[PDB]
Design a protein around this ligand. Structure first.
Ligand SMILES: [Cs+]
Ligand SMILES: [Cs+]
Ligand SMILES: [Cs+]
Ligand SMILES: [Cs+]
Length: 138
């Protein structure tokens, strides 16, 4: 049972999706930009990821810039509500499996929570080797 909050226009997200597939399961794919999680779901993801609310913020997207979010003037709940109102602020990809939830940045973070091993060598789309044929992380 795997879910990925995916942005097809982001290389890290594409790389993550293909690593998931290379472990042999096809995940549930949520285009968070158009189908963002609910407030309750979003709080849970953040808790399960073990990161701060602010570490989940995508920088260099228009709401981050225009809302002044780089400044330390926002509570965590304010930041969660901005994320819900402007889903492009949610950094990507988030992946949930039976073993846990991670913000998969860099994409190979996802190897921690995939239950089955990669089924063969995996190379990122830009040529960066991740795992060889033997299954060793390079
Ligand atoms: Cs939802
Ligand atoms: Cs693992
Ligand atoms: Cs292998
Ligand atoms: Cs890259």
């Amino acid at each position: 049972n795997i879910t990925i909050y995916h942005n097809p226009a982001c290389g890290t997200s594409r790389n993550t999706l293909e690593m998931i597939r290379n472990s042999g399961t096809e995940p549930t794919i949520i285009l968070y930009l158009e189908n963002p999680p609910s407030r309750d779901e979003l709080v849970k993801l953040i808790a399960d990821m073990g990161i701060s609310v602010r570490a989940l913020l995508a920088k260099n997207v228009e709401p981050y810039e225009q809302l002044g979010l780089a400044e330390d003037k926002f509570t965590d709940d304010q930041l969660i509500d901005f994320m819900l109102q402007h889903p492009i602020l949610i950094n990507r990809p988030i992946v949930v499996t039976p073993l846990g939830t991670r913000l998969c940045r860099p994409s190979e973070v996802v190897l921690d929570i995939l239950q089955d091993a990669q089924k063969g060598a995996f190379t990122k789309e830009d040529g960066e080797k991740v795992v060889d044929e033997a299954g060793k992380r390079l």
